[PDB]
């Protein structure tokens, strides 16, 4: 199963608070890993939000396939007939879903299986405060290793071969960074009250931005990728873990009663939010579509992955809770 796979980028426009588990300080700690402690999004939540977006798009009928609009109302009768019109009532009764979502993003609550499995969103660039170069995208060598291991399964052509050259070792008090972050005169850079000596190297950042722009385009989520290169830093594993654990946005919130104009008793709590401008990557595994008299337009796996990439490229979607206060909006750029 799962003949093909695709890579989905995710850029956090606004802080994201996905899910909720030690919760030592934050009453609602972010969706976090266990072995490494990096921020992450469970495949279940990403699959849910993607399938909700697909269902809403199917209702709105803006899922143009091969530069041709996809009308599901005629398609369900064409492929099912008999009770298909009655099946339409099930969509009208909200007890089911349109056939495209049922055959791609999993079945309904009640036989079959989804054509795509949504993996976890692994972190790729973490924004941290810098003394110079106001904020910097920091990574870790094992982050690059995970990226390479994940990306060996899709691209392979020459990009996969050249990506194997990424192999670095960093001490707990050393880093490699661009010209913007390194302080003038002194050969050290300060991020989040941590001082690191710059290690002389001019290949790892170049290759990282090279592959990033290679399968994400020159336009790095609405910004020129060249400007990003000057503000890329790679730190040690422990340093990256500490950054991803303690550099998130801890925001204290309260509830005020209009009767007295003060904070309600027991209404103060701290919520942890994943920082904005955070690059994350997810793997979507697509297999052979379920044999249910599928149209020849998406008969093969290549067609369905193509239509998914086309309909989800440069998209905007909300993840996690706190949607009503402008939290969770991210931009997705499918890897072509």
């Amino acid at each position: 199963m799962f003949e093909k796979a695709v890579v989905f980028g995710l850029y956090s426009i606004t802080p994201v608070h996905a899910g909720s588990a030690e919760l030592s300080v934050i009453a609602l700690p972010i969706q976090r890993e266990r072995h490494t402690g990096f921020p992450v999004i469970w495949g279940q939540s990403l699959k849910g939000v993607l399938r909700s977006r697909f269902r809403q798009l199917e209702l709105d009928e803006k899922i143009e396939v091969e530069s041709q609009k996809w009308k599901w109302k005629e398609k369900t009768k064409e492929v099912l007939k008999e009770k298909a019109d009655e099946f339409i009532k099930k969509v009208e009764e909200r007890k089911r879903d349109p056939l495209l979502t049922e055959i791609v993003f999993g079945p309904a609550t009640d036989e079959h299986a989804g054509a795509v499995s949504v993996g976890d969103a692994k972190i790729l660039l973490f924004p941290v405060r810098s003394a110079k170069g106001v904020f910097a995208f920091v990574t870790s060598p094992i982050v690059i290793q995970r990226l390479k291991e994940d990306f060996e399964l899709v691209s392979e052509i020459e990009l996969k071969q050249i990506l194997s050259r990424f192999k670095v070792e960093l001490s707990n008090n050393e880093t490699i960074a661009g010209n913007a972050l390194i302080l003038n005169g002194e050969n050290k850079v300060i991020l989040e009250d941590i001082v690191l000596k710059v290690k002389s190297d001019s290949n790892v950042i170049e290759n990282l931005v090279e592959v990033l722009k290679t399968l994400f385009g020159d336009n790095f989520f609405g910004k020129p990728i060249e400007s990003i290169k000057e503000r890329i830093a790679i730190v040690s594993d422990d340093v990256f873990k500490s950054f991803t654990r303690f550099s998130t946005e801890i925001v204290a919130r309260v509830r005020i009663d209009a009767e007295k104009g003060t904070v309600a008793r027991g209404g103060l709590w701290y919520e942890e939010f994943l920082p904005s401008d955070t690059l994350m990557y997810s793997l979507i595994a697509v297999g052979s579509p379920k044999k249910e008299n599928l149209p020849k337009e998406v008969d093969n796996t290549q067609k369905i992955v193509n239509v998914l990439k086309v309909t989800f490229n440069n998209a905007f979607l909300q993840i996690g809770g706190d949607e009503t206060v402008g939290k969770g909006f991210v931009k997705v750029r499918a890897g072509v």
């Binding site: 199963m1 799962f2 003949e3 796979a5 899910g19 909720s20 588990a21 890993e33 266990r34 072995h35 490494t36 469970w42 495949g43 279940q44 939540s45 699959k47 849910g48 999993g106 299986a113 989804g114 499995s117 993996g119 976890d120 094992i142 290793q145 995970r146 291991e149 994940d150 399964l153 793997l283 595994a285």
Partner: protein
């Protein structure tokens, strides 16, 4: 042939308890669970873990023989009281050592010696990860297995079958997927096969045999019990057996949902992996391989046992 599967994500293997119970736990991978993965891509010898940190090594479940201080326990019997106890040569009471033992350490282990560098703790191979608020009351908390950065699951299958070499396939509980590749037999199994003759000669000359269960085994004939039937040992060439001393853990209770009959499979009890039997055999062992299958469902990867001397 070894199917090396690196997990891109966490993995889930459902507990026997159902999950309106929102709480859910996780267990180690079961041979019936991994058998479905390979059959979706014949018999399965078993499955171990693999760690590729500079070098590539295979880890089996740590034997219950090994103690915390890496001290082997041997069953010695007192005729004055006529009772056999498992003495560690450093104390009369001991606890099993959790973790994993490498094949390069396993080859020496069957000779009665183990090195500190030949074992790996459980925290350095994988961990347990809890997720809460997954999906007003629909939220359910699920525990999963999070593997290390350079570790995964190796499935040891006899070289009599062939299929696609490399790809991605879905395994486990919830819809996850891992990247699988076909790797040839490493030098560890070759070294074990080469030293099998010497260790078998040692077993024959010493008149003592040790069975090490690297995989869970359903040894029950009519019901399900941990007792070792003498007929099974007699097949390998054991003329007679004097005493049997088995040490293991809590039996693993498991079942499954049979899609063919649309009904759950019968609940089965199996001897937990890592349990070791000590047998004072008579004669010699005629087995030409250092691994044998015991109990039922041996095709799916159950009851893989190694031979050892003491």
């Amino acid at each position: 042939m070894i199917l090396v599967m690196k997990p891109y994500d966490s993995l889930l293997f459902r507990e026997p308890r159902p999950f309106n119970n929102h709480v859910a736990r996780t267990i180690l991978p079961l041979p019936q669970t991994l058998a479905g993965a390979v059959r979706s891509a014949f018999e399965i010898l078993g499955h171990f873990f693999y760690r590729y940190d500079g070098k590539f090594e295979l880890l089996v479940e740590s034997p219950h023989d090994v103690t915390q201080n890496l001290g082997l326990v041997k069953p010695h019997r007192i005729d004055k009281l006529g009772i056999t106890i498992l003495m560690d040569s450093e104390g009369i009471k001991f606890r099993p050592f959790n973790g994993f033992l490498k094949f390069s350490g396993l080859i020496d282990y069957l000779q009665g010696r183990i090195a500190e560098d030949s074992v790996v703790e459980r925290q350095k191979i994988f961990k347990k990860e809890r997720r809460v608020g997954i999906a007003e009351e629909h939220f359910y908390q699920v525990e999963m297995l999070r593997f290390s950065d350079d570790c995964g699951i190796a499935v040891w299958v006899e070289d009599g079958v062939d299929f696609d070499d490399e790809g991605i396939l879905g395994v486990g509980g919830e819809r996850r997927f891992v990247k699988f590749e076909k790797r040839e037999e490493p030098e560890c199994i070759t070294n074990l096969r080469s030293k099998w003759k010497k260790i078998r000669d040692k077993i024959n000359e010493t008149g003592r045999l040790k069975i090490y269960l690297a995989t869970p085994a359903i040894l029950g004939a009519k019901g399900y019990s941990s007792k070792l039937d003498y007929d099974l040992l007699g097949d390998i060439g054991i003329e007679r057996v004097r005493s049997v001393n088995f040490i293991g853990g809590k039996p693993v209770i498991f079942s499954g949902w049979d899609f063919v009959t649309r009904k759950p499979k019968p609940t089965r009890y199996a001897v937990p992996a890592g349990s070791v039997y000590f047998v004072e055999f008579e004669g010699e062992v005629k087995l030409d391989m250092p691994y044998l299958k015991l109990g039922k469902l041996t095709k799916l990867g159950y009851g893989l046992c190694f031979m050892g001397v003491w």
